[PDB]
Paper text:
Another helicase loading intermediate could be resolved, yielding an 8.1-Å resolution 3D map of the “pre-insertion [name]”. In this intermediate, [name]–[name] has a conformation similar to that in the semi-attached [name]. Crucially, at this stage of complex formation, the [name]–[name] gate is open. However, the width of this gate is smaller than the 2-nm diameter of the DNA, suggesting that the gate needs to be widened when DNA is inserted through the [name]–[name] gate. Importantly, the [name] [name] establishes close contact with the AAA+ core of [name] (contact site 3). Furthermore, in the pre-insertion [name], [name]–[name] positions the DNA adjacent to the [name]–[name] DNA entry gate, while also supporting DNA contacts with the AAA+ domain of [name] (contact site 4 in Fig. 3 C and D). The lack of an [name] [name] supports the direct positioning of DNA on the [name] AAA+ domain, as observed in the pre-insertion [name].
Numbering used by the authors:
A (entry chain 2): 201 to 412, 414 to 431, 450 to 460, 473 to 595, 599 to 706, 756 to 864
B (entry chain 8): 303 to 418, 433 to 449
C (entry chain 6): 103 to 194, 260 to 405, 450 to 463, 511 to 834
Write the structure that this text describes.
């Protein structure tokens, strides 16, 4: 149509007149940055041209495929009169339509959203890149040896050609792509995030096409993609990013956190199914609430996560707590063994059978919490990958033509069983578990349960589990899970050097007493752990800084984990820690 | 202490510019009808200004310009809004709506300042129609 | 002859849809609910309506239904045009799906002839395999050979079509236009495999299977490995006789005998000796097999997660026993029973292996014994000669009730509730009383767990019962002896199993107060043990006796359980 000719000259006049701040045309700086650095991506906010002309925004929302035939041409014309001979190196320059107001979900993708612009959130998986895909074909008929060709896009397998022109034969046909179209690949499968899916339903998944934006995306992270819907053809990608906090719920959270010591109420709200004991749930709540990451002049990155390790006889409950926190906590990933969930933590090059090739993928929650069940039953790859992720916070991929070091700042909640069923209390934990000391040193809290013969446990456990079967004060679950996301995304409580030096005095007693009576020592990692546990309790208390008695609970948490992880012969240490108890 | 001159003016008058483009983003389509709901509108304007948008700001936009947005509440509890025209908002009609909104805000600021530069207004929210019985 | 009959049947169908509104207040007179159904889908715009054939069979004394019923494929665009006209006049991107359901006759796969080609049919059976979802063409954009003009071509759901004349008189050729996918219209298409049910197979015949196609939003509803009932049109495929379905559903003196059998007092004693009349002795194994057919409540929670409310039964002992005979009885008597040999199985084989089809090299998912016969007994003979992969798949299927399959890019999880009858043997065959169950069974602790009851059978030379066993064996070897005969047949036992299955009892407070003391009494035996005691006692054995309590409550048909019937379950746990 000729109506595009009055559209073109309108936006050609628009790019030379957009002065939003202090009378400065930002498009001249944008065109000189794309021309000097040889870029092909042009950035246009939707609000700018929408404030200028809403009919262009309506045309972009209705027919973006024909609206994109004007944008690239006027961008190349602006780059050609701004820079001479730019067409010799770059023939086409695309545009990046950002700031889409109506962000859709993956379950709202319907038949009415066809051939239009849509901004969707998700998580990327299945990374296959830089391959020549098809769009046209040719075929060689072997009987007469002839050529015939149609079209083939990006959804079907291939359009079988079985009828020759003059052979009228059903002979064997061969694929000729030696006269054929250009190829560009980015087959990425995107999925819905688990932190915003409704309960009972399953997250959907789609396939996205990336062309002209390859390997700038990180698998296992949240992403925002703006593209057209037909299979989504992405135009813009954003690696920066329904259950969120509001203004009416944020005042009551400070009012709840100010009154009646809510740390124990959060602990009692953690396990509604059973009675339990506070040693598992205290470590669980401080691991899910986490600490703060700090660096000094861009280096010395400390891990802000807390990795807890559960141990005890297999008859007790260890998977129900992680099953409750998988629904409760945000971006919680439950992974298991060889690959129960068909997703893992380790990078891998492997063959794929759906299309029967070799591919590379770095598995997977960068801010979330990963839950590992049956920690002693694994191979060498998933032990070394979690040891690298527990040692430092990055996982490297060095295969299939790609080299990427991705962030691995995830918390680890692992559960295990000893060799033989019984805990065997007259031996230490290093002789009990099959694991060694440096993989045990990454886990700061080692919680362990035992068997209770006495009437007390018989009076409580059997009665609670029969109350759960005969039926067909704490903080509620919704306010608790909203408080987790509200406190983990807004505050960062530091520490002040006024009277904190006293913990360096008590560590000086507590280190020395572990040599003379005990066999296992205490190091600086325990000091880093109790400072993280104290700042996690200050985060849960929602204070400006860590108080003086948060370290008392932190030293109680480290004493009932380290002293309980040893023999019965460290019994004098049960009374030696009674002076600070 | 209203201080609306230092505060509300400029920020509130850009609410209509984002809101007029987001009601032509959904309601205007050649595919499958659909009624403009307030649950998918607040997040898009949240993307526009990057700031938190409370659902009462749209009610203030209704208070300054009443006849564009109908406040009727659906039976499901969600509060829908619509436009009087059925032939949809043209780009020229969108510019005329922006000029009418800025002219209406200038008229409210001009009439309210005779009591004493913006003088005193809190940009009072419009009364939302209550469900019967 | 149907060109003037199609407009009349379109007028009749729209008169049927126009003359019936809703006047259903106070359960008075009846009139159809279609206009409010269209008014409800006005917001969601899916247009995948459901029209009952029983509600359509009353107009024109059924004659309108009989004329539509044979010429359904020849009257289908007139019906969708009448539906389009009534939603265009009653309401202001347009796809439509009209589904018919609830036919009065259920037809098998062996009674399909060529006289019903194009007519509607109800096909019931079991789904064997499932394929991936694929985008079906719908309408394409053809370009000419010289005009380069766009033509919006509408397919007719048969095969790749092609126009005949160019609309612009710049050309009149008939050579090959080229296809175009920009202005094209895609959707979900699926091809599944239906097969003949196990209760209606002829004597000596083979259970002949067939492929059925499905479109609209009837896809992604049919779960693999379940009894299904489809309603559709018989369409031929180049030839082969396939089917097209539009509706999917997950189907699957008598009271004078049942009320007489629930009023006595010695029913359970004949039930434990009538659940396996061919086996001499072993009342405990018969008790666990009888209580392992019916379970308890699985949704006993306040959090929102389903629990394991089933009974797992595992038999061990020396070889050449009668423990496989129970295995041969369950599968010959229980309708929801799948038997496997164990060695002729694998991980994928047990639940869902993948096999290729050459039309496009595309995969289809074959099922198996696992995830079949829900709320029934899956019986695995030779449990210890299996691999590690299928046993951790069994453990993953027992840790959570759902099962997940991740293959070829697609992820699919489904509900599963089966009771495992595991037949195992030792590493040396002979059971020695020297050590524990763990070292003799030779399998790891998590797959040894989640098992409610273990049955150990040891044999020796005890002449008084041995001569009776050998006499019963030689008396059984004759033409239909009365020695085997039970006190009552299976004829009332099947409806008794179903009547006890739909009972759902509720435990009491006195039973719980006696149960906590019984658990303390059972855990007191662990103190100063190592005699008779052979395994550990924790929450799992407490859950096993809790699940056996509602099973004995259902077997005795009591709504509120007393602790005296749970005392027999306590004695059964003490006997093991």
């Amino acid at each position: 149509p000729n109506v595009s000719r009055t559209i073109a000259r309108e936006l050609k006049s628009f790019l030379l007149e957009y002065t939003d701040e202090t009378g400065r045309s930002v498009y001249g700086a944008r065109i000189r940055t794309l021309g000097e650095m040889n870029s092909e991506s042009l950035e246009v906010n939707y609000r700018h041209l929408a404030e200028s002309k809403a009919i262009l925004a309506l045309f972009l929302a209705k027919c973006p495929e024909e609206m994109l035939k004007i944008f690239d041409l006027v961008a190349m014309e602006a780059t050609e009169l701004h820079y001479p001979d730019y067409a010799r190196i770059h023939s086409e320059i695309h545009v990046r339509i950002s700031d889409f107001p109506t962000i859709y979900s993956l379950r709202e993708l319907r038949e009415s959203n066809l051939s239009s612009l849509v901004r969707v959130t998700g998580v990327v998986t299945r990374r296959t890149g830089v391959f020549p895909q098809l769009k046209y074909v040719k075929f060689n008929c072997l009987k007469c040896g002839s050529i015939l060709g149609p079209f083939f896009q990006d959804s079907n397998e291939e359009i079988r050609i079985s009828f020759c022109t003059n052979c009228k034969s059903k002979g064997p046909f061969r694929v000729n792509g030696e006269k054929t179209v250009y190829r560009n690949y980015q087959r990425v499968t995107l999925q819905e995030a688990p932190g915003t899916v409704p309960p009972g339903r399953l997250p959907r998944h789609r396939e996205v096409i990336l062309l002209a934006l390859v390997d700038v995306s990180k698998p296992g992270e949240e992403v925002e993609v703006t593209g057209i819907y037909k299979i989504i053809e992405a135009n813009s990608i954003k690696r920066r990013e329904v259950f969120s906090w509001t203004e009416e719920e944020e005042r009551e959270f400070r009012k709840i956190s100010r009154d009646r010591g809510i740390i124990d109420k959060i602990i009692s709200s953690m396990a509604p199914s059973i009675y339990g004991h506070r040693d598992i749930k205290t470590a669980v709540a401080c691991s899910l609430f986490g600490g703060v990451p700090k660096n000094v002049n861009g280096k010395h990155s400390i891990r802000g996560d807390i990795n807890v390790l559960l141990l005890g006889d297999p008859g007790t409950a260890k998977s129900q707590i992680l099953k409750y926190v998988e629904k409760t906590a945000h971006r919680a990933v439950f992974a298991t063994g060889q690959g129960a969930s068909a997703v893992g933590l380790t990078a891998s090059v492997r063959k794929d059978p759906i299309t029967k090739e070799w591919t590379l993928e770095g598995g997977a929650a960068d801010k979330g919490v990963c839950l590992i069940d049956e920690f002693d039953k694994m191979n060498d790859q998933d032990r070394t990958s979690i040891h690298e992720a527990m040692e430092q916070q990055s996982i490297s991929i060095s295969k299939a033509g790609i080299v990427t070091t991705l962030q691995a700042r995830c918390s680890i909640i692992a559960a295990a069983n000893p060799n033989g069923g019984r805990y065997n209390s007259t031996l230490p934990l290093a002789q009990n578990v099959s694991l060694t000391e440096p993989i045990l040193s990454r886990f700061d809290i080692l919680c362990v349960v035992r068997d209770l013969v006495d009437e007390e446990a018989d009076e409580r456990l059997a009665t609670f589990v029969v109350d759960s079967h005969v039926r067909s004060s704490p903080i509620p679950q919704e306010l608790l899970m909203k408080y987790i996301h509200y406190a983990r995304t807004k505050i960062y409580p530091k520490l002040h050097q006024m009277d904190m030096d006293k913990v360096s005095r008590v560590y000086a007693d507590l280190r020395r007493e572990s040599i003379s009576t005990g066999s296992f020592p205490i190091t600086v990692r325990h000091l880093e752990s109790i400072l993280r546990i104290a700042e996690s309790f200050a985060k849960m208390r929602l204070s400006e800084f860590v108080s003086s008695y948060d370290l008392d609970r932190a030293i109680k948490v480290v004493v009932d984990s380290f002293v309980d992880a040893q023999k019965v012969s460290v019994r004098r240490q049960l009374r030696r820690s009674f002076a600070i108890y | 202490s209203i201080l609306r001159l230092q505060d509300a003016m400029k920020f509130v008058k850009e609410l209509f510019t984002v809101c007029e483009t987001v009601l032509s983003l959904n309601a205007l389509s050649r595919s499958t009808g659909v009624p403009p709901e307030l649950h998918v509108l607040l997040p898009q304007i949240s993307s526009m200004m990057k700031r938190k948008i409370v659902q009462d700001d749209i009610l203030k936009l209704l208070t300054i310009w009443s006849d564009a947005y109908v406040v009727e509440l659906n039976s499901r509890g969600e509060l829908t809004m619509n436009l009087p025209k059925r032939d949809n908002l043209t780009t020229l009609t969108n510019k005329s709506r922006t000029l009418a909104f800025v002219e209406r805000a200038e008229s409210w600021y001009q009439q309210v300042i005779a009591s004493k530069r913006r003088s005193s207004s809190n940009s009072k929210t419009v009364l939302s129609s209550k469900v019967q019985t | 002859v149907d060109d003037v009959t199609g407009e009349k049947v379109r007028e009749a169908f729209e008169q049927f849809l126009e003359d019936f509104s809703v006047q259903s207040t106070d359960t008075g007179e009846v009139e159809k609910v279609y206009r409010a159904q269209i008014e409800f889908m006005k917001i969601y715009d899916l247009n995948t309506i459901y029209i009952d054939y029983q509600h359509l069979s009353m107009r024109e004394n059924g004659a309108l239904a009989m004329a539509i019923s044979e010429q359904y494929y020849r009257f289908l665009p007139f019906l969708q045009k009448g539906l389009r006209r009534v939603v265009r006049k009653y309401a202001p991107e347009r796809v439509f799906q009209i589904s018919f359901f609830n036919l009065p006759t259920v037809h098998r796969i062996r009674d399909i002839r060529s006289e019903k080609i194009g007519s509607l049919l109800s096909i019931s059976g079991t789904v064997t395999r499932t394929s991936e979802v694929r985008p079906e063409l719908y309408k394409a954009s053809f370009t000419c050979d010289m005009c380069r003009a766009i033509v919006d071509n509408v397919e007719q759901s048969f095969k790749y079509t092609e126009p005949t004349f160019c609309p612009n008189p710049s050309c009149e050729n008939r050579a090959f236009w080229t296809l175009n996918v920009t202005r094209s219209r895609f959707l979900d298409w699926q091809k599944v495999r239906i097969q003949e049910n196990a209760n209606e197979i002829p004597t000596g015949s083979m259970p002949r299977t067939l492929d059925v196609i499905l479109r609209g939003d009837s896809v992604e509803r049919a779960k693999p490995g379940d009894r299904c009932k489809f309603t559709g049109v018989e369409i031929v495929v180049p030839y082969k006789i396939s089917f097209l379905a539009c509706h999917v559903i997950s189907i699957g003196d008598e009271i004078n005998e049942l009320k007489e059998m629930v009023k006595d007092e010695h029913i359970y004693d004949k039930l434990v000796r009538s659940i396996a009349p061919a086996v001499f002795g072993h009342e405990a194994v018969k008790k666990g097999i009888l209580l392992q057919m019916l379970g308890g409540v699985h949704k006993s929670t306040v959090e929102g997660i389903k629990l394991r409310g089933d009974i797992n039964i595992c038999v061990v002992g020396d070889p050449s026993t009668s423990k496989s005979q129970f295995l041969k009885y369950v599968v010959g008597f229980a309708p929801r029973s799948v038997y496997t040999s164990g060695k002729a199985s694998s991980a994928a084989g047990l639940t869902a292996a993948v096999v290729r089809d050459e039309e496009g090299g595309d995969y289809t998912i074959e099922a198996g014994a696992l995830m079949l016969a829900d709320n029934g007994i899956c019986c695995i003979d030779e449990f210890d000669k299996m691999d590690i992969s299928d046993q951790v798949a069994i453990h993953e299927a027992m840790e959570q009730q759902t099962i997940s399959i991740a293959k070829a890019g697609i992820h699919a999880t489904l509900n599963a509730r089966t009771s495992i009858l595991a037949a195992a043997n030792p590493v040396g065959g002979r059971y020695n009383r020297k050590l524990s169950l763990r070292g003799n069974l030779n399998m790891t602790a998590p797959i040894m767990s989640r098992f409610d009851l273990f049955f150990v059978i040891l044999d020796d030379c005890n002449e008084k019962i041995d001569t009776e066993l050998a006499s019963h064996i030689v008396d059984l070897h004759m033409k239909r002896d009365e020695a085997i005969e039970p006190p009552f047949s299976a004829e009332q036992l099947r409806r008794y199993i179903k009547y006890a299955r739909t009972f759902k009892p509720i435990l009491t407070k006195e039973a719980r107060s006696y149960l906590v003391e019984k658990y303390k009494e059972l855990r007191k035996d662990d103190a100063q043990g190592f005699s008779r005691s052979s395994y550990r006692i924790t929450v799992r054995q407490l859950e096993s006796m809790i699940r056996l309590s509602e099973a004995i409550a259902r077997a005795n048909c009591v709504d509120e359980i007393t602790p005296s019937f749970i005392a027999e379950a306590y004695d059964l746990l003490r006997q093991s």
